[PDB]
Amino acid sequence: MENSFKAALKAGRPQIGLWLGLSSSYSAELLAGAGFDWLLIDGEHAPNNVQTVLTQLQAIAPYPSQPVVRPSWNDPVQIKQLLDVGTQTLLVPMVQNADEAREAVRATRYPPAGIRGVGSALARASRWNRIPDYLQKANDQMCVLVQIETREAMKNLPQILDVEGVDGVFIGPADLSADMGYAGNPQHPEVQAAIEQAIVQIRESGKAPGILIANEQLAKRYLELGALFVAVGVDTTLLARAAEALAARFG
Amino acid sequence: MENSFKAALKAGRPQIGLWLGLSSSYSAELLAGAGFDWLLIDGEHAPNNVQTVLTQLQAIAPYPSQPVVRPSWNDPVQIKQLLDVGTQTLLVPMVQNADEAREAVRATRYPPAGIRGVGSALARASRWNRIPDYLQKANDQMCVLVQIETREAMKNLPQILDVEGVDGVFIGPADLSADMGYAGNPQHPEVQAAIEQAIVQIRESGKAPGILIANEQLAKRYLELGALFVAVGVDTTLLARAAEALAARFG
Amino acid sequence: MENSFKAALKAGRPQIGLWLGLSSSYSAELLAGAGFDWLLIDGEHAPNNVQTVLTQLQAIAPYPSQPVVRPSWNDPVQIKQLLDVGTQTLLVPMVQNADEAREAVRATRYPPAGIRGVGSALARASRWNRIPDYLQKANDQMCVLVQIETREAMKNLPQILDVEGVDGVFIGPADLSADMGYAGNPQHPEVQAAIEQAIVQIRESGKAPGILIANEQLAKRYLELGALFVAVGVDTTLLARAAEALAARFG
Amino acid sequence: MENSFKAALKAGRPQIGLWLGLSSSYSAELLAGAGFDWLLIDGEHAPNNVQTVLTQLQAIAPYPSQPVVRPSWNDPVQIKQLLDVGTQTLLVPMVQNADEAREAVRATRYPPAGIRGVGSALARASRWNRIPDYLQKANDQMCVLVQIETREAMKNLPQILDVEGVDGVFIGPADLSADMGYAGNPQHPEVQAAIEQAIVQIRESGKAPGILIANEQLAKRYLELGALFVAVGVDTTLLARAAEALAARFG
Amino acid sequence: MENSFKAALKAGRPQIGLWLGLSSSYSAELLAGAGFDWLLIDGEHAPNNVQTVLTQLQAIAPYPSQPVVRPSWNDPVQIKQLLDVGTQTLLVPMVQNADEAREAVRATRYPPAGIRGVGSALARASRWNRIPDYLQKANDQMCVLVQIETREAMKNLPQILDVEGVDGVFIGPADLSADMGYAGNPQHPEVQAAIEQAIVQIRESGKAPGILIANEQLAKRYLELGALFVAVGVDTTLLARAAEALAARFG
Amino acid sequence: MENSFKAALKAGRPQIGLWLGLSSSYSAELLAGAGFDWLLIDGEHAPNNVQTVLTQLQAIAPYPSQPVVRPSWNDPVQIKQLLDVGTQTLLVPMVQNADEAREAVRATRYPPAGIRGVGSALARASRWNRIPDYLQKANDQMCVLVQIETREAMKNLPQILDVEGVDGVFIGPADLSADMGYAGNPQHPEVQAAIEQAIVQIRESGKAPGILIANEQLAKRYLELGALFVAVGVDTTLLARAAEALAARFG
Ligand SMILES: O=C(O)CC[C@@H](O)CC(=O)C(=O)O
Ligand SMILES: O=C(O)CC[C@@H](O)CC(=O)C(=O)O
Ligand SMILES: O=C(O)CC[C@@H](O)CC(=O)C(=O)O
Ligand SMILES: O=C(O)CC[C@@H](O)CC(=O)C(=O)O
Ligand SMILES: O=C(O)CC[C@@H](O)CC(=O)C(=O)O
Ligand SMILES: O=C(O)CC[C@@H](O)CC(=O)C(=O)O
Ligand SMILES: [Mg+2]
Ligand SMILES: [Mg+2]
Ligand SMILES: [Mg+2]
Ligand SMILES: [Mg+2]
Ligand SMILES: [Mg+2]
Ligand SMILES: [Mg+2]
16 A cells, blocks of 8 residues: 555656546546556546545556545545545645644544544455554555645745645645736746746755646746646546547538 | 526516425426526535536526525535536525625635635636636626525624625525524514515615515515515425325325 | 235225336435325336336335336346346336237246246345245236237237236327327327227226326226226426426416 | 437538547536537447436537437337437447338337337426427437448448438448458558448438548548538547647656 | 434433445345344445435335434534434534534534524425424434544543433544554553443443444443443445455365 | 456366445445455346446456456347446356357457457447557457356257357356256255256366355365356355344344
8 A cells, every 4th residue: 555656756756647627437547547647636626526536546546647636625524534435645725824734634644643533444445454554554655735825825835844744735826826816827927936936945845846737838847847746737628628629620 | 607697686687496406407407497587406405415516507507597506504615616517606505694695705706806716627617618718707797695594694684785795685484483483484473574574675785685485475475575586486395295186186 | 025016906906106207216205205006117218227226116115105117118138137126016018919918927937937037145126035935935926017009909908918927907098099190199089998998808807907197087087997007197297397387377 | 309410411511520438428518518510429339328328418408519329229129218318319330221220210200100109298308298299290300320330231221221211321430341351440442442432322312421530631531522420539539649648748 | 203213222222233334225225134223324434425325214214223324523514414314313423522512412403402404395304394393303303422532532521421412422442542542453451441431431321322343242241331322343344354254265 | 458367267277256246336346355266247137237337347457356247138239338348258148059159259259250349449448449459359358158047058058068259158056946946946956966067068178167156065066076167155145144143143
């Protein structure tokens, strides 16, 4: 049950990802064989729940691509449920300060290091108690990634980076640009500057910078600055744009 | 993506509605062709979730009847998820004061006017970014209806009506009568008086009064007093009572 | 595991029924408490399969109303699957002659009386081998009802009535009227006479006549004539018509 | 309930299509807004059934793109069920001769023109008896497309083209090439000639030629030759190839 | 709608239970016929939600085994939703003090005794208003069981036992042992002592002690000390261990 | 895409199996980790379809246990659909003679060796055209197992064994005993002799004998005799019996 995504980040190996919002175990398997290092199962902005996350994890399992799950918010109860169905890497939205980052971390760890509720007999996480000493091994294989999405979060970045258990910090350009006054449009120089400065700062602390960016030139720019988990497209977008282009070429 | 239900309320056109608690995209389509101005998809008192709301919205889409969705509570996270699958008109339960009404409104609006999280690439709401300038157009087509269900809420009605973005105020007779000490039985004169006084007061402020009432005489009475969104039946009730009556006529 | 619907037909007690086309375990429970003697789960003209039949049987189980299932056709494989999830009373469409009636009967019976495949360990039918001597008790509690829907079938009715195991014969006025050249108008005198004559002939043979008819006056006529399983309405119709009428009363 | 796809074929307007194998009502809606004239819901080679077809029809309904459904085979029972959930245009696989083409046609038509079973009260097809005179209007809006996939079928093409009710003939290059001894390589000259000759012959008979081809140059050739319903891509392929290419650009 | 599990506890009749984490209405029915007094539908540590709880309640209904439901946390909104689909006995996790116990109780009761929201027309709980005077009868048939899972909870046990409406107190050995510093391993003498002392103390107050324990010797020991609701196994464990043992016996 | 179960039979390595009738992707994963060589997903006697087979295959995929699928009957259409979602090993019920065995084999093979329809772009089988030369590699990795369940089939066994492509012959004791006049009691000497003799004859022909038997002593006897794929239990039975026994130990 070693977390290979977590190990790759710690070793400074950049991980190229794809965002999954189609909310389907079928398309999830199809995309799990496409060659990405990681796949983001979005429980915040796509119609997913614990049950559909579970089936997407099952679909993805035999492939090399590693699953990352985003809960709808920094909720210890939801986090608990996602962990028990087998989630090991979390992308937690709207983390505003060090306290909230710490809460996210503690929600993924069994006491005394955290408040994770025990239910291994019932959980896919322990393979229903087949994994020996699961309760002792689980904490170390949890990978917690926190999203900074506001000016407030940006101010607090230094303290957030000081939180043990925070393995990565993800910058969401859409929410960030909106909070900065550019209505979801990240292209503006002020937004780009904040993003790139944060990436440098995150990597400087030894933690992993992450971002979602569909512009491939910007993706490489972010990678060059030291970003370690970079999602470079979204399944819904890839499908819609390719279908639209195709239709247009035939009038 | 113009909100026609919202426009109708603002123009003082009464909207006749049906409550949907069958939690099925199939019966939802069947009822969408029955001639109602609006349909209430109940996520509070029927076994619905974001996923089943989505399929009921899809079923209803091609019909003239306009969908309204009730979340299980005034939860910004749940509200966010419902909006992204395409919800534009919300009926928010247990709004007790102006602060809570304001929170409901802000949960439906992108910054700076609100705290709505951005995820349009993934969302049916923007038709996966097919709607041009979606982020700039969305706020104005959101219609927020708040429920007053207690004596406390009734005291605070004047302040609630002062909240910008509150387009309508819905009175729930069941909860209200229970809170007033008449165990869900709204017939009592004290309950009726509170209801009718509120309706007059709501309309006086230029906002839309709403109510659910299965008694058709009371429905017309409420309409006469200026109610603008009136649900006049419930799918489960219509089905159960008609089936029971039918069976009884054959012994 | 006694088939009470079968026993009632055999004792000449008329059974009043409702047709279920909403294909939902939820509305199925709601209607199971409405007071009908039987409920028809329609696998021919509603979007059902073995799986949704199963969930509707589970929903109905604790209520007095007895379930009857209609497969999409006289198919031994499908019949086998429906029996194993617990179906004891079948309504088989488009039975044209004695050979086809005999095939329907034999599909429901274990060898040597029939060709029903054995899989009791797996099946809800035996409550997973919890019912003692299930393999010996099963055959006698199967109730086979065959549909006559064409002039050819009407002609072969005497022979169909002579098939052992055919417990009842159901007349579908819609299909019959269509075959007679009056598509969708069973009202025509020639159709009503054929129906009346069939009902009398069936009852005189010592077997149960059945029919679906939404017109309550005709239903009572057929009951007067000796029909023993009479469905007097359809769930989709009850709901649609009640809803449309309600909407109309408010313009 | 007018069949606009059928009308377009009859008027000689070419229809550009996309194949749907993702078996999801969600991705179906996403693609329904992409600008295609028609969408093929594949019940033969994708994991669909009557139920998932229904939800995909509901998702597609409000969009301009017209749905076409392929049953798993030329099965009158399955065809009956697909029609009742609202299917008006069918693509029937493995039609080998005129008799089988005639059977396909008659499965879609009410007596006396066909053997379609009557169940309008229950069916989305008539919007639950809300469409007036449905039983009289239905036959004329059915559009039957038959697949020729073997040398035997090619030989019988003249006779198949003479069957009234066969509105179009579709050539499946994959199956045809396999039958001709070039499994999975329609590129071979002998195959292309057979395809071209069939298209010309179909169009000259006054009926619509159809084909699926992912190669955009060949698609344009077949259109040049007079093909009237041409699917130019497959959803699973578009998604898989776009995703794989994206991943490859980042190594 | 009498709560027989609740009555049995009040009468001091021990109830033997099985834990359900397979999250399936099918296996739930299979196990409902296995002879247990109660069944725990786990919404905290198994992938269940309100919808799947509903279908498991439907599956279990006709059997003697009584359903108990565990929500994911002490959430009044979730509790409301579970009650309306028909839940009457709740096992509430992580109850730390008398205030939290009181909140749990009040969430299950209609005003004035609680804050339960009224929606009986829509609810399976009232059988869609078929149960006469449901609103007046419901409160008394609610059975609230609270879990004590930490040292803090243990300190507060005396006050928790003083809370009216708390019918039972459940000790979770896994969480408790973890909080005490024995990583989910309850065997340690310190854990066992706390557990047995609590059981004696709970029963002394006239309330029901409960526990889950797969060790059958420990189960009888707890019963001897006065425990009244004792779950003696878990469906996932029973299945996994039996399958593993079987496979091993054949190499 | 190599069929390891097929290779093992061919090499004479006995394969120990478990029957899956719980029809759940969740319990399927749980059991896939229990150490069996193969798992039988039953589409004949459990409520499965192509869709649930697909999800069970996805759940099982990362585990060593190899999936085998039983269609509801020897149906080329259904077989086609099962193969396209990725089924490589089939257990075909009620194969009565050599012609039917040959039909089963040809349904699994692309022309000219068979009649398998081509749809690789759409199918999980080729991982959506990601497996190179799939159309050329597929035939050889198909493994066809036929069930003999009647005296007629026993009589035709020598001819069935002569059909190329029949890799194994499975004896179902329940159905066979029923056909021989001992319904549900394979224990009878005449039945055991028929079974033993069939196993020997199958193995002597150079093909794999198979059987399901819950009695562990008989299983070992059949293995001794040369049976190569032996299912030694059923998931529903294991669960039901373990649960019932546990409940009984507490009275
Ligand atoms: O492109 C989108 O709108 C969908 C994904 C975002 O919500 C990802 C995110 O967290 C962010 O960058 O704000
Ligand atoms: O009639 C019912 O009980 C169902 C709907 C209510 O919850 C609607 C509501 O909000 C209220 O009037 O309290
Ligand atoms: O009223 C309808 O058309 C719907 C149900 C029929 O399929 C009933 C039937 O079997 C028949 O009357 O032919
Ligand atoms: O491209 C593929 O192989 C997938 C779709 C086919 O089934 C289309 C078809 O009907 C044919 O070309 O034989
Ligand atoms: O055995 C398990 O881990 C599954 C069930 C527990 O979460 C039950 C519980 O509440 C407890 O004893 O901590
Ligand atoms: O034990 C049972 O009856 C359930 C499984 C059978 O269908 C297995 C089978 O194929 C046979 O033995 O006839
Ligand atoms: Mg964001
Ligand atoms: Mg209310
Ligand atoms: Mg009929
Ligand atoms: Mg083809
Ligand atoms: Mg616990
Ligand atoms: Mg068998």
